Amino acid sequence: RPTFYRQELNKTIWEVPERYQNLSPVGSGAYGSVCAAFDTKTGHRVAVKKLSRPFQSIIHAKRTYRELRLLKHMKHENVIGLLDVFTPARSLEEFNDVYLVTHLMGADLNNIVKCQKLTDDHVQFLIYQILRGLKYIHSADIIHRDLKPSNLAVNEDSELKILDFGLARHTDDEMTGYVATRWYRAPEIMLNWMHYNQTVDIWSVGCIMAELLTGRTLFPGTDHIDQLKLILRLVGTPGAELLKKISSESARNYIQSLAQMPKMNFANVFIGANPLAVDLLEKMLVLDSDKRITAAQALAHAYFAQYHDPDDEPVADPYDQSFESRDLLIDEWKSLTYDEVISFVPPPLD
Ligand SMILES: C[S@](=O)c1ccc(-c2nc(-c3ccc(F)cc3)c(-c3ccncc3)[nH]2)cc1
Ligand SMILES: O=S(=O)(Nc1ccc2[nH]c(C3CCC3)nc2c1)c1ccccc1
């Protein structure tokens, strides 16, 4: 067991192995606290995340287990994975803190869009990387569910990774009621219209891509009703085929209660944009989740011809999500998490 040292930063207590030096706060929130640090063992700059109250409730405990299981699984250039995971606890009994370690990423798209638009060539590269990462995630039957600029980390050389994936599993219970994530959420997950699949994430990508090309939020709704209004203004009110598949009577009632909207010509809306980009946007921003383009299909779109390589767009090992259906106690989840900490094999430095 390594030598730990203690430190207070922004009122948060950090206890980490000595190999991690020069801890510097990069952000905090509900998810937890992140510090940038220097890993003296490897020479690499890293981000260290301390989980907030990992075992405060069953939901917290289950969420903690979930995140650790997810991060241990992710082995892809466009998805954050685990360099290390540690606790300062010496046994299960005193285990109440979890720290996660990944390669440091300078920024996110939330602040790369700054408040200006990108070039078409830059967008191509960023969206390509998002899609390549989503292909991998989707292949393991993992759905992000809350993809947005702030959870896409980017380097100074414009290399991109998805973070906070697979954790949008709150379901009903709000408490955490977060906002401004509705802007990128697919209609069917926000309003629980119809059966939802992996292409909930493609909708988000469509919204992100739109925003990078124009410098504007595509659908800046102030609530669920406003949000849907803004969406239907662009894509048009559901046709015959799609109305039939709406499982909710309330939703279906509401849609049909609204003044009918035509689908707009995207060439008009996205005026001046690369017509390959517009075409891809058309395929991404379709209400019918059965007809929305998939990650793998999006990668093969001609918009990405400069980057697409079917021999280097890998899929994921099988991921066991059976734990998700289980109703266990705090101490069970917490013990399952501890097991996962102990069994963590550091990835080879090469
Ligand atoms: C506010 S939004 O919900 C949100 C959620 C998580 C993060 C967020 N989580 C991490 C993060 C760090 C380490 C780790 F092991 C897992 C995740 C990072 C991170 C990773 C690498 N370099 C810089 C920062 N950012 C950021 C924003
Ligand atoms: O899960 S990871 O893929 N692990 C991993 C471990 C060691 C690595 N060293 C290198 C360099 C390329 C030659 C040396 N990439 C490496 C990748 C991963 C990648 C990025 C962030 C977190 C986790």
Numbering used by the authors: 5 to 354
What does the study report here?
p38α, also known as MAPK14, is a ubiquitously expressed mitogen-activated protein kinase (MAPK) family member that has a key role in maintaining cellular homeostasis and tissue organization. The p38α structure is topologically similar to other MAPKs and consists of two lobes linked by a flexible hinge, with the junction between the two lobes forming the ATP binding site. The activation of p38α normally involves phosphorylation by the upstream kinases MKK3 and MKK6, but p38α can be also activated by non-canonical mechanisms that involve autophosphorylation. Here, we report the identification of p38α inhibitors referred to as NC-p38i, which efficiently inhibit the autophosphorylation of p38α while having a minor effect on the canonical p38α pathway.
To characterize at an atomic level the interaction between NC-p38i and non-phosphorylated p38α, we performed co-crystallization experiments with either compound NC-37 or NC-38 and with or without the ATP competitive inhibitor SB203580 or the slow hydrolyzable ATP analog ATP-γ-S. Both SB203580 and ATP-γ-S have been reported to bind to p38α facilitating its crystallization. As for p38α, we used a recombinant protein that contains the single point mutation C162S, which facilitates crystallization by reducing its aggregation. We obtained well-diffracting crystals for three complexes of p38α with NC-37 or NC-38, two in the absence of co-factors and one with SB203580 bound to the ATP binding site. Our crystal structures show that NC-p38i do not displace the inhibitor SB203580 bound to non-phosphorylated p38α, but were able to bind to the catalytic site region in crystals obtained with the non-hydrolysable ATP-γ-S analog and in the absence of SB203580. Furthermore, we have found that the side chain of Y35 does not participate in the recognition of NC-p38i molecules, and is oriented outside the ATP-binding region, in contrast to the orientation observed in complexes with SB203580 (Y35-in). In addition, we found that NC-p38i can also bind to two other regions near the catalytic site of p38α, the so-called hinge pocket and the allosteric pocket. This alternative binding mode was observed in crystals that either have SB203580 bound to the active site of p38α or were obtained in the presence of ATP-γ-S. Interestingly, we could not observe in the crystal structures of p38α bound to NC-p38i the hydrogen bond between T185 and D150, which was previously identified as crucial for p38α autophosphorylation. Therefore, it seems that the three binding sites of NC-p38i compounds interfere with the formation of this key interaction, which leads to the inhibition of p38α autophosphorylation but barely affect the canonical p38α signaling. All the solved structures were unphosphorylated, with the DFG motif at the beginning of the activation loop in the active conformation (DFG-in).
